[PDB]
Automatic annotation (TrEMBL):
Transmembrane segments: none
Record-given protein name: Outer capsid protein VP5
InterPro entries, sorted: Capsid_VP5_Orbivir
Family statement: Belongs to the orbivirus VP5 family.
Biological process terms in GO annotation: symbiont entry into host cell via permeabilization of host membrane
Keywords on record: Capsid protein, Outer capsid protein, Viral penetration into host cytoplasm, Viral penetration via permeabilization of host membrane, Virion, Virus entry into host cell
Amino acid sequence: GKVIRSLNRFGKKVGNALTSNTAKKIYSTIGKAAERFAESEIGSAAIDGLVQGSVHSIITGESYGESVKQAVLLNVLGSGEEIPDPLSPGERGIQAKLKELEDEQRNELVRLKYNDKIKEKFGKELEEVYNFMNGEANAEIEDEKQFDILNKAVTSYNKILTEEDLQMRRLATALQKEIGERTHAETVMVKEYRDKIDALKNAIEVERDGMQEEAIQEIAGMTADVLEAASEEVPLIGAGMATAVATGRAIEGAYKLKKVINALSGIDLTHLRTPKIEPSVVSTILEYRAKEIPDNALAVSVLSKNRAIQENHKELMHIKNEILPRFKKAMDEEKEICGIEDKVIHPKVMMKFKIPRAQQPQIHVYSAPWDSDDVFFFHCISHHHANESFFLGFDLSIDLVHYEDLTAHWHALGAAQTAAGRTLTEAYREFLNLAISNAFGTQMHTRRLVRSKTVHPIYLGSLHYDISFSDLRGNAQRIVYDDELQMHILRGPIHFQRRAILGALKFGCKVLGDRLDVPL
């Protein structure tokens, strides 16, 4: 479903100048709705106070007009990170190998502190995979083909996922169940989690009272090791007075599962991730400004993180059921046809499943091929297990956004869905032609050869998003539909509006302040 709205900005309008009638109308329709359902007599009386009040609040809300609330990007910062400019592959590509390093370093002491207790739950398998990578050689060895180790890494990784999932689902129903219904073990688990959320509410509220008077930023910025303690819904092993929560995104990588899978088969799984705080939690805490948020709201946000972790699980199952068997078949067929020993996995077997880098399930950033930083667009791609993607492009000069669902992707390791959908190509073709035909407040455009008819985006790399793909698509919707979001999010130097658009896409952004309901 293509959509080509245009962005709002504060200097607009200016100015209709009626300026009332909102009072005259809200009374006129309110009187007619009473004329339909059995007269005005009941309200004359107590309801007229409600009307007069809502009209009053509505009117003074109208008095402010344009008007700039302060709005945050729901991602706690925390540690040295910024949000990369989505238009300098340098900056953002650094930021990826940087997160892989801080991560490998910090997971490592999850493996240190919890090794034996982890060998209890998932046990014997994980440590074998971690040894297969960085453990010293040369014993016991022999037991033992690489393809078995690849399978061991996957199945064990899936063992972690169904554990994290089953645990989240148990905590969410516990949050729902409400006191008399809750078992003892569940009251305890809800009480713990509720307390962690109180630490967080306290943090966010202190961070937010200290924010400037019209600010855009990230809501809060605590060091990752501390926020993990104050926020992880479901630690997977009981934290015996060490630090390092065994988050299980931690065990995923404490043991190098993802990394060994990727180093054996060619398959990249870096895109299986979860937000470090669920954005909807930061959102709930934000709109219960100081008034203990109910168990149900908590369970909603827990379920909401759970759907992202269920997405990872489904991707994993797509790799295990649809692609490992294909990988085996290709491997021993490689041995058959020109072996190529099949003790080791030879690289031409890995390359047999190698999708083009532009279609990894991340956010890909393209840019117009001429000269502005005005035009650019994201192609966001989603998990292979369900491989729909979309197109979200901006021309910040003739302020307009252009959103569009794209089609299936027939590459080597997508699922087969039905073609939707335009190509990525049809989409940016029309988008860039629109950006060019709309330009008449600059000369010498395009300046491209043969005077247009015509042009193609310059591709610029990509970044991972941590929320679920449908949460991402919901953020892109909310960028093209919400006028107030666009006004706030589109503000500083052009380079900052770019950073902020990527922010509100990648984490989501919520504007602050209050609202009141209408009777009729």
